[PDB]
Amino acid sequence: EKKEKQIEQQKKIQMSNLMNQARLKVLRARDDLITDLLNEAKQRLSKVVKDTTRYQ
Amino acid sequence: SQSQGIQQLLQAEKRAAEKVADARKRKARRLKQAKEEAQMEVEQYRREREQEFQSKQ
């Protein structure tokens, strides 16, 4: 029973750790989308700068 | 004359004595024999549970 519990405990650790890395992976993908949006915003501001009439 | 009957009875009783001493001593000897046989059961148990533990692994 103790040996079987060793295997079960390793299963618990592995499932927990895998799920945790999955959580952080999704959150980092979200942060990456936000970073993409802000880079797009920077490029759009550069485009505005190209246009003197509004830039003035 | 009666010593004849007494002799034959004492001889039959000696036979009974040795037979029954073996009967009693069989208990003492087979207790040790069982102390030996416990190995069969415990080792078989271990090997079986090893098989299912390998299945679990």
Q: How far is B54 from chain A, CA to nearest CA, in Å?
A: 10
Please indicate if any CB of chain A lies within 8 Å of the CB of B27: no
Chain B partners within 8 Å of A3 (Cβ)? 53
Chain A residue with minimum CA distance to B56: A4
Q: Are A4 and B54 in contact (CB under 8 A)?
A: no
Query: Which residues have a Cβ under 8 Å from the Cβ of A16 and sit 6 or more positions away?
Result: none
Which amino acid does the sequence have at A51?
A: D
How remote is the C-alpha of A1 from its chain's centroid? 41
Tokens of A15: 């499932």
Q: Are B57 and A7 in contact (CB under 8 A)?
A: yes
Give the distance between the most distant pair of CA atoms in chain A: 79
Listed resolution, Å? 3.9
